[PDB]
Structure formats: C-alpha cells, structure tokens
Subunit: 428 residues, 3 copies
C-alpha cells in the first residue's frame, strides 16, 4: 500500500510509538500527581490501645479506643509548588520526546517501506542475475558438454551460479525481513507496496543549512527536549532552593476518644476524674516550619542541583552542536545523495545503452544472449543502485525533516505521492 496508508496503519499500529503515547500520557497524568499535594489532605485513622503498667504505674491502665478524622493543607511550601512546575517541565520535556517519537516512527515509517522496496528492488535484480548466471553456467556445461571448456570452467560457473542462489536466497530472505521490518512497525504482512514513480520524482536541491539549522533550533525536538530539560533542572535549581523556605501547613482533624480505666488504680475515689474514657476533640489550625540550619544540606544540595544545571547547561551545548552537526550532517548527506543518483542515474543510462549494446549486438548474433543477460543483469544493478539512492534522497529528507523537526506527515505524503504504483513482496 501507499506510504501514507502504510503510515496511518502504522501510526496507530506502531507499538513503539504507541508506547510513547501512553508514556506521554502517564507524564501529563503525573501533573495530577504534581498538584494533588497542593490539595488538602483528607484521611481517617483508628487505634485500639490498652495501657497496662507493670510498675508503680501498674493498676493505672485503660482501654484506649479512638476514632478521628484528619486533614492538613500545605500552608507554606513552594517546593511542592516548585516541584509542581518541575513535573510541569517534566511534562513539557516528556511532551517533547513524544513529538520526537512521531517523527521517529515517521522516519522509520518511510525507512523500512522503501527498504522493502529496495529488497523489492534487489529481489527484482538478483533474479535477473540468476536468470543470467544460470544461463552462463548453463552453456558452459554444454561447452564441457562440447568439451569447449574444462571442468574448472565447468566447476567455477557452477558455484558461480550457486553463489547467485547464495545471492537470490538471501535477497528474498531480505525480502521477507523487509516485510517484518514494516509489519513490526505496522503489524501487517503487506503483499504489495507502492513503487517509486520515476517521471514524477524531481531531484530537489534542499535549503541552506544556515536557516534550517536555525529553523530546527526553534524546532529540533531532542535539542528541544534538552532545552526544556535545561529549563527543567532550572527549577531544580529552585526546588532545593525551596529547602531554604520555611513551611506552613493547615492542621485540621477531629474524632472521638473513648477510654475506660481498668485494673487496680482504676479503683479509687476518682475525684470526679476516674471514669469511662469517652470523648472526642477538634484541632484546627496551621503548622509552620522554617528550617534554620540543617548543616548545609540544603546548601550543598543547591550546588548539587546547581552543578547539575551546569552539566544540564552543558547538555544544551553538547546537544546544540550535535543538533548543529546533526543539521549539516543530514544536509551534506542529501546533497551527496543528490550526487550519487546523478551518477548512477547516468550509470543506469550507461547500462541502459550498454544493455542495448547487447540486444542490437545480439539481434545481429554478434555477442551471445547470456552476455545480454549479463548486461541485462547489469542494468538492473543501477536500477538497484539508483533505486537505493532514489530512496536515500527521500530518506535524507525525513532525516533532515526529522533533524529539523519540520518532519511531519506532510513530509510523509511527498514520499507517498511519488509512490504511484505498488509492487508486492511476494517472491516467485
């Protein structure tokens, strides 16, 4: 099927990405984990407690039975608020990766596709080679059959042929694995897939890396992912800087306290005191806590987070040149890829007229037919080689589109569009 359909099936059917999607979600969910702390704290304990003294305190004993409701709010404590934005930035960062992931599958989506095609391509080529080398070896036999050759002559082409199987075999295997690569990502055995339409494929001189480089710099996701990551730890700078902060928290609870004395010193005058332990109480208010001196723990930590931010600060640079280098990297790849095709494109023509060289050389019976097959084999090679390049240039686009981050399902269609007629994977 065409790449977009190839894609759409995969973009849903792709489990890796699909894992990203979830892995994306749990993040944004964690935001909830983030805020709930900013929520009041509601809960219920209960305890069955019996005090029994074994000493002078003996005889003074009771069943302590109690029920209490409790809620506390975090009065003063921005570190949570800090930590809040942290997961906020986590979400943003974690958000980043998924965005990467789309292109990733996007990227990989095209890859295996045309790979299948390449295997589709090779699978096409090598057979013709076998279609030839068999012949060559074939009549060599009948040269030995005619005795016009010796057995090494006999033998060499024999293996020389069998090496073809040694090729074609692996080819189809590659054919199949071409399948699985796509079925893996996609999840379906795909009989056919769109070949590359040659007349409608224009070699396209790409953009200046200067802008694109700056383009993805606003864009490129890992570089994006780091930047927020640099942004992320930035708060980590200020999370442990929230250890400095004192805390104040809402203190709210209620419940019944029910006691009955027991044992010896439960026995007495009671003085309007000794009675059945039964009541309930209410305690409402705040809890403020200001750390004064912890031993520099919060101090050392800040630097820790601080010096983290440095390496964090590092990673931007470590990332930026990379994304930088990544930029021209893809850039120089496509152009080189541009060059190759124009070479092999020439090359195809080479074999082309070269291939003709057989026919009008064969139809005049000057040169043999197997040779035609030989050259017949050859043309497909560039048609192999060329095709491969024809995929690469398309390949590099996404990588660029990828590295740019500009890569989108529009960068996919431009692939899919030049995809015009399908070819099956079916080895015959």
């Amino acid at each position: 099927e065409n790449l977009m359909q190839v894609y759409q099936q995969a973009r849903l059917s792709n489990p890796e990405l699909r894992k990203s999607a979830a892995d994306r979600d749990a993040a944004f969910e964690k935001i909830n984990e983030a805020r709930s702390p900013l929520l009041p704290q509601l809960g219920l304990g209960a305890d069955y407690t019996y005090s029994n003294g074994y000493r002078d305190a003996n005889g003074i004993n009771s069943n302590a039975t109690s029920a209490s409701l409790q809620l506390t709010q975090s009065i003063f404590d921005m570190s949570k608020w800090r930590a809040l934005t942290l997961q906020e930035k986590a979400a943003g960062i974690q958000d980043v990766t998924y965005q990467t992931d789309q292109q990733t599958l996007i990227l990989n989506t095209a890859t295996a596709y045309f790979n299948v095609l390449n295997a589709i391509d090779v699978l096409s080529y090598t057979q013709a080679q076998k279609e030839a080398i068999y012949r060559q070896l074939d009549q060599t036999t009948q040269r030995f059959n005619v005795g016009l050759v010796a057995i090494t002559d006999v033998q060499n082409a024999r293996a020389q042929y069998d090496t073809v199987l040694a090729n074609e075999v692996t080819a189809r295997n590659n054919l199949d694995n071409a399948v699985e690569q796509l079925r893996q990502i996609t999840g379906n055995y795909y009989p056919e897939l769109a070949a590359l339409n040659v007349e409608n494929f224009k070699t396209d001189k790409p953009q200046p890396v200067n802008a694109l480089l700056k383009e993805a710099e606003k864009r490129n996701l890992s570089l994006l992912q780091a930047r927020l990551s640099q942004d992320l730890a930035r708060e980590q700078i200020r999370q442990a800087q929230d250890g400095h902060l004192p805390t104040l928290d809402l203190t709210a609870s209620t419940g019944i306290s029910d006691t009955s004395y027991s044992g010896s010193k439960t026995r007495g005058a009671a003085g309007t005191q000794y009675d059945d332990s039964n009541m309930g109480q209410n305690k409402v208010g705040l809890s403020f806590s200001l750390p004064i001196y912890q031993g520099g723990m919060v101090n050392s930590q800040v630097k820790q987070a601080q010096y983290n931010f440095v390496g964090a600060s590092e990673q931007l640079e470590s990332a930026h040149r990379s994304v930088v280098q990544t930029v021209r990297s893809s850039f120089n790849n496509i152009n080189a890829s541009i060059s190759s095709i124009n070479a092999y494109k020439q090359a195809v023509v080479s074999a082309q007229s070269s291939l003709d060289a057989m026919e009008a050389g064969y139809s005049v019976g000057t040169r043999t037919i197997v040779d035609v097959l030989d050259a017949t084999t050859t043309l497909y090679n560039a048609k192999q080689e060329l095709a491969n390049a024809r995929y690469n240039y398309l390949i590099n686009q996404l990588n660029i589109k990828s590295a740019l981050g500009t890569l989108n399902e529009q960068d996919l269609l431009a692939l899919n569009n030049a995809l015009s007629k399908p070819v099956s994977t079916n080895p015959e």
Copy 2:
C-alpha cells in the same frame, strides 16, 4: 579443547553469567525484603531529656529518664501484600533475566568459539597466501634479476607482498583476539579447540516459522521477560490501586518511664504528686489507617501505572512482533546461511579442482608453481569461507535456539558434536 568444556568452563568462569546468577540470586533475596515488613518489627530506643522552664513554666523541671521496647506488625495493608507480589514478579522477571544469560553465555561460548576456528581458519589461509604471494614476489625479483620485470612490477610486487604480511599479522592478532574473545568469557589460555568436522557437519532444514515462532513465544525469554515485564506492570496498577485501602497494623510497646522532677516547681509539698517517680508501661494493639482524600493522588497514581502498564503493554506487542521478527530474523539467516555453504561448498569444489588444475598444469610444468601457491592458497579461501558459513549456520543454529528460547547446553552439545579434532592457535 572441546566446546562443551569450553562452554562448561566459562559457564562457571563467566563473570557476566556468574554476575547474573548472583544478580538473579540478588533479586531472589529481595523477595525476602518484601515479606520482611509483613513480619513484626521488634525495636528498642533510649532518650535522655531534661525539661527546664525559662518562663512561668520555669521551675517546671525534671530529669527525663526513659527507655522502652517496641515491636510493630502490619495487620491490614494490601500494598505490602502488593509489595509482596511485586518483588515476586521482579524476581519473576529477574528470574527470567537469568536464563537469558544462559543462552547469552551459551550463545557467546559457541559464538566466540568458532571465531577461534575462524582466526585459526583464516590464519591457515593467509599463511599460504604469503607462501603463494611471497614466492611470486620471490620470483618477480628473479625477473628483475633477469630484467624480465622492471621495479614497478617489483615495488608493487614487493608492495603486493607486504600487504600480505599486513594481512596475516592481523589474523594472528585476531588469532589472539579470537582467543581472548574466548578467554574473556572463559578466562583461560586455550591452545587448541576442536574445529568443525566436514564429515559430521550437516546442513539441516528447520521447522516452520509459524511453528517455531509459537514455540519461542512459549520460550523466548526476553519475550517471556517481556510478558512478566508486562505481567510485572500488572501489579503496579493494582499496586497503585492499593492506596485505596485503609491500613491496620499491630501496635505494641513496653518500657520504663523514670521521672525525677527538678527545680522550684518540683519543690513544695508535692501535693502527693511531685516526686522522682519512675515507671514502665505497655501499649499493644492495632493501627487502622484508612486514607480518605489525598487529592486523588492514589487515583492519579493508578492511571500512571495504568498507562504505565499499557506502555509496557506495548512491549509485549512491541517485543512480540520483534520476537516475531527475530523468529523470522534468523530463520531466514540459517536458511540463507544454508545457501551460503552450498555456494562456497561448491565454491570450494570450484577452487578444489582449480587447485588440482594447477598442480597437474604445474606437475607437467605447463604452468608455474606460483599459481599452485596462488590456487593452493586460493583453495583455503573457500575452505576459509567454508569454515565460516559452516560455523555461521552452526552460529545461527543457537541464535535460533536463543531466539526460540530452545537454546540450551544441549544445543551447545549439537555444536559440540561436529567438532572432531582440535588444532592450536599458536602462529608458527
């Protein structure tokens, strides 16, 4: 020596594996950790306090002389139970991970093994290459000695030769290399291993992938490791589901309270109250703790695990198609691997008579001896390439077994079967 012991040796001597076995064993301890808390917690503590009022509460003073014994138990908490099953799965996965290293170790031991043969193998080749290529260079000078060549023939011929030298040493390097590969996992200098025996060696047709794939699916351990990985995540959601329940736990304490008052408000008539009095007490019972509202934290927690499982849920599918892939991965390999030998095996035959063609042609002297060296050396290359594929098929054999999960120390034996007579690595 023999791959079996060679395996068997490093099977023990393998630090990785041994690390694994322990590392596996390490986890299986952790299960204990999980259950531990569900035991009573018996503990003891001591505190020396002195309370001095600095205000109207001044003169309210005593030695705080106190100690007590404390035990604690968990009555109702499922999360601990959750924790209980969790590490069970962790061990469940961890346990799985271990076997992975068997085939892992198993795979390697065979893996690095034949490389010795290869390194041995090629080394055999390249040596004769020098024997061939040198004598050529050897004769070439004889021409320049007869003037029959110029130096250009000579320098290149010499150069032609030297590359041979360049070639060979690396082998011996690789020789040791391939040797050390084994020593690495194994750890013992090995003079000679039993190489493949062309007599026993049998190219062998495997089972249907559709059958194989299922089998490993019951077998392949990473995939197994995957399901438990997923299965592992199963708990976690249920773990995250365990913030709901209240917690009931066993509350027990005993110890002495020894009170000596002090200061002005300790002084007086004492009101039949104030006086260095010293006691000890017991508190035993349950802690029921029912969460009410954490802010849906437990709630958002779950979804976290929820997606968390699903993103894991991907891995199954993610790994399954891949393990499906791997299923089709090597199953192709071996077959194409099969095609390999059949080519070179013929190809050997090709060179075989090719050699023979030489010797006779040299025997009758119609041709030089250098050619025989050429071909003779030439023969080895196939015989060289031969051993490789001979191993590679064998190599892919286990990989399938690994991928299948069918791999075992019996599958080692299968390899261990076609190895007849060892030969050293010592370069002569």
Copy 3:
C-alpha cells in the same frame, strides 16, 4: 591549527568534559551532603491550634498558641558514618569517572583530529581522482568525437566519471563532517590543522603486554573505576551491616507554650488551675535507638548488598579480563597497525614509482597522460591510506594510553609532535 591547542581548546570548550568536571564536582559536593546530617539540625516551627470538645469533653477549649526552637544531632549512628564513607566512595568512583573523560576528551580530540586530516587527506585524493577520471572521460568523448568509442564507453565513462563526483562531494561533506567532529567537542570553525609529518613520524615498538597490562591495572580508570565500584559495594554490605547498631542522637528543643483556655469547662473557679497561662520550655538530650527485630530486614538487606557486592565483584574480574582484553585489544591493534603502514608505506612506494613509471612513459609519450592522472591520483590513495594508518597507529597510540590509563595531555603532545605544517579544510 595544532592538535595541542586544538585539544587544549576543546579541553576547555568541551561541553561533555566540562559537564564531567562539574558532574565530578557535582558529586564532590554530595560528600558534603553526607557529612551534613552528622551536623546538628537547627530548626523552627509554629502551630496555631484550637481544641473544642463536641462531647462531654465539650467546653474543654483553649487557644493553642505555641512555638518553639529545635536543634538535633546524631550521637551514635554508624550508618550515617556508613553514609559518610559511602558518598566518599561515590565521589571516589565519581572522582575516578572524571579522569576517564580526560582520556575520553583526550582520546576524542586526537580521535576526531586526524579525521580532519583524513577528510582533508581523502579530499586531496578524490580531487585528483576527478582530475584523472575526468580527463579520461574527457578524452573518451574525444574518441566518441573521433568515433573511437561508442557511447557505451561514453555513458559508462561519463557514468564512470560521475561516480567520482559522487565520491568527492561526500569527502567535502566529510570534510565539514570531520571538521564538525572537531567543532562538536571543540566548537570553533578550524581552517587548518597541522597534519602528520612523514619526517618525524616513527613507527614505534611498545612494551610487553604482560608489563603493559599490569601498568594499566594500576592505571586504567574504568578498571580503577571498577575496583572502587567494587570498593564502593564494599561499604554497602557494611552499610547493610549498619542496620544492626542502635542509634544515639542529640535531642534538643526550646520554645514557648502559650495556653489560653476557652469555653464552659474553661469557666469556673479555675481550681487555681484554669487560666490564660503561657510558658516556654527546653528539652535536651540524646536519642538512643536500638533496632531489635525488623524481621531480619537488616539481615536480608545485607545479603542483598552481599551478593550485590559479588555481582559487582564480577565486574572487577568482569572488567579485569576485559581490561585485560583491552590490554591485548589495542596492543595488537597498534602492532597490526604498524604492519598497516609498512604495507602501504611500501604500497605508497609501489604507487610511487608507479606514478614515476607513468610520467616517464608519458614523458616519452609511450603512454597517455590520463594514466599519470590515473596513477598520480593512484599515488594519493596509498598516500591517502598512508595518512590513515599513520594516524591509526597514532590513533591506537592514545587508545593504548587510554586503555593503559597512561593516556594524558602529554600523550596528546606525542601526537602534537609529528604534526608539522597545517593545511586547511576548505575545498577549492
């Protein structure tokens, strides 16, 4: 320019390294964290409570007006002491990790360095290739212009040429590539670096592995990093051994207790008791806490660490043979590396006269000029390959130094010594 500064530059400008230095520095802070707790913990807190009975305890009411100061110290806990040494080792390892990046950075700076030379190198080659291969194609048409060729010669020849173009651009690509490789670590556009000087360049025989291996064993830092890694785990068991001991800690508090009763049971004759009292108090002393039974948790904990150390214990052996391997890894490399140059160095000589053979043959015109271009370009390939091995030996030099751990900014200097006269990367 010069590798030294080139190194020296990125040695600072290297974000990775700099990350490391900080990252190293980051840990060394954490040591502070470890010691911090063993300091007194000075702290302050405030709570506003109001207690209202809703039952017979109703009318039992007051403003809870309270605040206090609190400091805390650890008297006897070794685990903290354990914690103390732990991060010490962590720093101990972390400290080790840092140097790794020196050689790391050191290795790279040299590493990516000569690639510039290579990229420079090959680029020099391929250019002449075009000069050769074009003129060929150039003359070929002249034949087709004379009819002396058909187009098949032509197209292929043209095709033959175009591949050259395909070839070269990648170099320049790689040119920038190799350039950016350096800028990545370094970060500055570099016109020209000093290339290898065939005059100073000396193939040099190393020390005995048996001697070298030991040396790195005192040196190679990952292995060093390993032992501390093991050494690190040493504590942890002992850490896990520290759940045994009781814990004695300094218990100190001061603050005001300001009590204003309220409600019905606040009202009355007060019994010389009920009233708007307000106080402040001091509590100082020790916390002795002796664990008794956690369920063997401490016990099972240890074994965890116990095996944990051993599985780590593997790494030593695991890494040791490997570092042993690495010892034999490159030590072979360099030597085989040596063999490399000796071949190509001759090989250069082979092409050398080979060129010369051409020029004379062209000088006398016995042959075309294209050949000279062919050979002339041909010469570069050796001269091309030459520079590589020339670097590779040099390259392996440091790797050994790294593997040895002997690698340093002096070893950079050794490389920095054979670099005579820089040359730009700018493709002309």
